[PDB]
Amino acid sequence: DTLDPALLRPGRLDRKIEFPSLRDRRERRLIFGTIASKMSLAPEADLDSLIIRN
Amino acid sequence: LRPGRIDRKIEFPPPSVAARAEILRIHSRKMNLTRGINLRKVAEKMNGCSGADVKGVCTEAGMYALRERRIHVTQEDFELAVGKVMNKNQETAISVAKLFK
Amino acid sequence: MTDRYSFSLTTFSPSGKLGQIDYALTAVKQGVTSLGIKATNGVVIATEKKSSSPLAMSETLSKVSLLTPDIGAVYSGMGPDYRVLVDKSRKVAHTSYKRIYGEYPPTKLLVSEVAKIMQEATQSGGVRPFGVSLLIAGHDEFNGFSLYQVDPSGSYFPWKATAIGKGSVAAKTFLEKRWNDELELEDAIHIALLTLKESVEGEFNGDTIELAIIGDENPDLLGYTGIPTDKGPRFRKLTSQEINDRLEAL
Amino acid sequence: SLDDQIFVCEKSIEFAKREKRVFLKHSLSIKLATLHYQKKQYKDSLALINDLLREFKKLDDKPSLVDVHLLESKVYHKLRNLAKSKASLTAARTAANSIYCPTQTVAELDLMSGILHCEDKDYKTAFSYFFESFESYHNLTTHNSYEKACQVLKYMLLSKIMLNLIDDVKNILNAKYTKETYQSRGIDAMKAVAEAYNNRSLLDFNTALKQYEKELM
Amino acid sequence: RVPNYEVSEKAFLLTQSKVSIEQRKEAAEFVLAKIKEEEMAPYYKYLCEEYDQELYNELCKKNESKIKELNEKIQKLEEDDEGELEQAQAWINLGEYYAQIGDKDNAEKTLGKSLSKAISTGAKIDVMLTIARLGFFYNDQLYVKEKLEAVNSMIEKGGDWERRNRYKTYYGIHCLAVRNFKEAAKLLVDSLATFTSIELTSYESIATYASVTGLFTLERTDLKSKVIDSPELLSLISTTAALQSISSLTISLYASDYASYFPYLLETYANVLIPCKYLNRHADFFVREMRRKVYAQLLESYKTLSLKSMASAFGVSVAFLDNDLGKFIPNKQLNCVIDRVNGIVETNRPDNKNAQYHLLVKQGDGLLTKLQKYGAAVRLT
Numbered sequence A: 001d002t003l004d005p006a007l008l009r010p011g012r013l014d015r016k017i018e019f020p021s022l023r024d025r026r027e028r029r030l031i032f033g034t035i036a037s038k039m040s041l042a043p044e045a046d047l048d049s050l051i052i053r054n
Numbered sequence B: 001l002r003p004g005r006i007d008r009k010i011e012f013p014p015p016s017v018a019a020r021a022e023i024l025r026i027h028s029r030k031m032n033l034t035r036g037i038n039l040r041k042v043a044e045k046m047n048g049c050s051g052a053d054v055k056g057v058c059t060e061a062g063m064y065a066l067r068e069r070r071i072h073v074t075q076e077d078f079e080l081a082v083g084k085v086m087n088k089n090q091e092t093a094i095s096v097a098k099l100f101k
Numbered sequence C: 001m002t003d004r005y006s007f008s009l010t011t012f013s014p015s016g017k018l019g020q021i022d023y024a025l026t027a028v029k030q031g032v033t034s035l036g037i038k039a040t041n042g043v044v045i046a047t048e049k050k051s052s053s054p055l056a057m058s059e060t061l062s063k064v065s066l067l068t069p070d071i072g073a074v075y076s077g078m079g080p081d082y083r084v085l086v087d088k089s090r091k092v093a094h095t096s097y098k099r100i101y102g103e104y105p106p107t108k109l110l111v112s113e114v115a116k117i118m119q120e121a122t123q124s125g126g127v128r129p130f131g132v133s134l135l136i137a138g139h140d141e142f143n144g145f146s147l148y149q150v151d152p153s154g155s156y157f158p159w160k161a162t163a164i165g166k167g168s169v170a171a172k173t174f175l176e177k178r179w180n181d182e183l184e185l186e187d188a189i190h191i192a193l194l195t196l197k198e199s200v201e202g203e204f205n206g207d208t209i210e211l212a213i214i215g216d217e218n219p220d221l222l223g224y225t226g227i228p229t230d231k232g233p234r235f236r237k238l239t240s241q242e243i244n245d246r247l248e249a250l
Numbered sequence D: 001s002l003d004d005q006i007f008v009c010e011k012s013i014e015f016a017k018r019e020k021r022v023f024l025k026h027s028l029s030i031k032l033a034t035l036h037y038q039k040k041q042y043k044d045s046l047a048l049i050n051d052l053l054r055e056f057k058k059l060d061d062k063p064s065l066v067d068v069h070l071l072e073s074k075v076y077h078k079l080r081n082l083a084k085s086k087a088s089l090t091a092a093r094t095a096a097n098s099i100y101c102p103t104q105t106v107a108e109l110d111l112m113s114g115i116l117h118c119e120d121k122d123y124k125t126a127f128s129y130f131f132e133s134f135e136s137y138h139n140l141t142t143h144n145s146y147e148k149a150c151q152v153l154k155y156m157l158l159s160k161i162m163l164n165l166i167d168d169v170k171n172i173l174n175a176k177y178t179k180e181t182y183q184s185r186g187i188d189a190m191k192a193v194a195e196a197y198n199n200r201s202l203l204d205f206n207t208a209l210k211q212y213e214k215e216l217m
Numbered sequence E: 001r002v003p004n005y006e007v008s009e010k011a012f013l014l015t016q017s018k019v020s021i022e023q024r025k026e027a028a029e030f031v032l033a034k035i036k037e038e039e040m041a042p043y044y045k046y047l048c049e050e051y052d053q054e055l056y057n058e059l060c061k062k063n064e065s066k067i068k069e070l071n072e073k074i075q076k077l078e079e080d081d082e083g084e085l086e087q088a089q090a091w092i093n094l095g096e097y098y099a100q101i102g103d104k105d106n107a108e109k110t111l112g113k114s115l116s117k118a119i120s121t122g123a124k125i126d127v128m129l130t131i132a133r134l135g136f137f138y139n140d141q142l143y144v145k146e147k148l149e150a151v152n153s154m155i156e157k158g159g160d161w162e163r164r165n166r167y168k169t170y171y172g173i174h175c176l177a178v179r180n181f182k183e184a185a186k187l188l189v190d191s192l193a194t195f196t197s198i199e200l201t202s203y204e205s206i207a208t209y210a211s212v213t214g215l216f217t218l219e220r221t222d223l224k225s226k227v228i229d230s231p232e233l234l235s236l237i238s239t240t241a242a243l244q245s246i247s248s249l250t251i252s253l254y255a256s257d258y259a260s261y262f263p264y265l266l267e268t269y270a271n272v273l274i275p276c277k278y279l280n281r282h283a284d285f286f287v288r289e290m291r292r293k294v295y296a297q298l299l300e301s302y303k304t305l306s307l308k309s310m311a312s313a314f315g316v317s318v319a320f321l322d323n324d325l326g327k328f329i330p331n332k333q334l335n336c337v338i339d340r341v342n343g344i345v346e347t348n349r350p351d352n353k354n355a356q357y358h359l360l361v362k363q364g365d366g367l368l369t370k371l372q373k374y375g376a377a378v379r380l381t
């Protein structure tokens, strides 16, 4: 709505994507997954406790 | 604004349902024709708000055939396509208001 | 920034919508997510409390104050405006209905008297709007369970469901999906907890969450038993333990 | 079985349209849609769904029509066409724009999109859906959701075989509830094939599928 | 219209004396039921050769009935004032009567009146096609050819996307019916998606035929994408016996199990190629091709095989193999020679520089022929 909505509008901009930033469990879970891949982790505590707490 | 030399003025309304039928018809002909000929239905049922609106309906209905890997549209697709385009136009434009009156 | 007309409250704004009134709403948003759900047989109001300092006591921060024993209030916003407004609500009501009509107000009448106070802190120049928007949830005999919003402007409206604060968007849609008025109260309490639980997930412990019902009378809490005809208190505030019971029912 | 089931349904669909609500006629059609799917009649099950469907395009939103799309999705996977399996995931998602739907409605929603990406040979996308479904089934009443918790547990395991990360095969496997209560023959199956794939021993894989043969079946 | 394809295929089983005696008479009862129902007296005279006068009285009667009905109607309509519209709708009903009795000639005449007064371009295309159908009913393909030509003139004059789908299927059938199986393979696989049921040989038949044209034309690679993984064929499943027989055949080819291929070939010949009229004439073309295509794929994977080994796999004798392969070698797809004495089948296939030499020298010779003809001509003139 920083852009004028009447002028800049669907069919110039027919896809207008809102990104989740409030985010779901799955969406969070994938981001943690980028890290989980990058280096092995020594299990010493629950992994999923951290997700819920975010 | 003030007198000077401007005199002729032409007023353009946003489309009516009749005019909407015309714009929609001719793009569908060039593209892939709406089968069961319910492009007339779509215009009768509702008004968009612009001819820009109408070209957006045209694109989306066609994109729905693409997801299936079909190359032809049907009425079922326009009925989905219209609700998506038109409703999105309303949810971006209403958010500005708080709760006044 | 804005006009000198719109800062003034004795001066018609260009738009006609004061800058002031709009500031009051920006602040409401900034506060806690508070909600109200109307049931057949009750009203539940529920909110989260400020965590404040670690060693600041949480209990003493009260975002639900009983106006009368049968009618409670909930707000989003600042503490100072809340308390002053609250003394004024009770006080004006005593004069105009507890001595005249020698009884507790209808919910509608109390809501009407709260709007008027509000209205005067917006009319008089140089006195800012109350920094707070209310829900006044309540019970009276005549018009049963009732649910209200009172705006710092001094307009009020009854609702089926409303929520205010940052998480107002989220909450309202959730209530719609899961519930309608015709459903019982018991279901709504579980629902309301879940709704508020989207808001924050770090702690949802019954210490930081204040949950109350206005519903049935409690003839125990009448406090001068042996006379039954007087209505007991409609309002009963549910303890932390009680919340925790209601969390395992979710 | 077939005989008892089919006769009762037919008889039942007539009372509703003759004296009671058109609502009642529609509830019984969801029963009939499930019955055909179990006969492995996927032509018949699509034809039945379709007779209704037009009058319920109007009424599209109800959790009960969310389930009709979900069933449709199933029906096209087993017909092995993924043109319309994909198409029918979209419809399900449209008619649950609000994702606040019941617990069982949500389990099935996650699980169809997972299986769809299995065929698409993406096992990053597939794995993630399975996890959310994992949790739904455990917290559900174990009327039969205890057996279906296991089926999702095998699908979690399956993704990670494909990606050939045996670290996460040991990670999932725990003494929390996986090897306890959701223990099956097929838990042992998945971790055994997983070790064979890693070594590069086709010989080991061949042995594993003889004794886990009923698991493939 | 609708009964004509059903009538003719039953009539064709009865004609054949190849098929089981049971099927021939099972078909007798069925064709008879429709003969009476539609009054086929002019058309019965064609069918009785090729394998009551009441049918004729019933005829003639149906003639004065359905014949008169339309007449006096047509006249009241020509008197009444709207010329363009009303007369032509009535002439469409006129063409329907001749089309019921299986007379392709008089149907053409009255439907010509219908067109004559101006009607919607789209409507003219529907009408031309109706005539076209009756050409399959007689089995006069030459008749279909010219009718279908007039439609393609009007298909893009109109813009009709609606009638384009029908034309695809009818043209599929045309190409299928004729010896060119190339165009057929293309036209018909896309008629699967755009199948229009209205006056045409059932959906089940189309699906079987698409597979047949698939197998003849398309490379092993090109079969996999377009026929096996073809989403429609998998949606339609195998229910009818003919679909099952042809489908199973496809599969064992790709999977290259050549224990099960040759039993399926025998099945498709009995139950699919011979009873379908179109594929009775092309039975020979199709089965000779299938034998060559499977054997070609196996030779490509082997520098050398034994005769006993190739044969044993198929489930034919060494003697049998030796004859059947020597038919196929001089037509040149197999590209092998057989050492009888050593018993080896050695395989010699070029893939080198020689490939690019042949293509060049041949194309460039075809160009020179043209330069001479044209140059010499223009000098004279």
Ligand SMILES: Nc1ncnc2c1ncn2[C@@H]1O[C@H](COP(=O)(O)OP(=O)(O)OP(=O)(O)O)[C@@H](O)[C@H]1O
Pocket (backbone or CB within 6 Å): B003, B004, B005
């Ligand atoms: N006193 C005046 N002298 C001349 N024409 C006048 C007079 N008063 C009115 N008009 C009328 O106004 C008409 C248009 O004037 P025009 O708009 O060219 O003038 P201007 O005042 O020079 O402005 P601009 O350059 O901004 O258009 C004239 O043709 C005439 O009809």
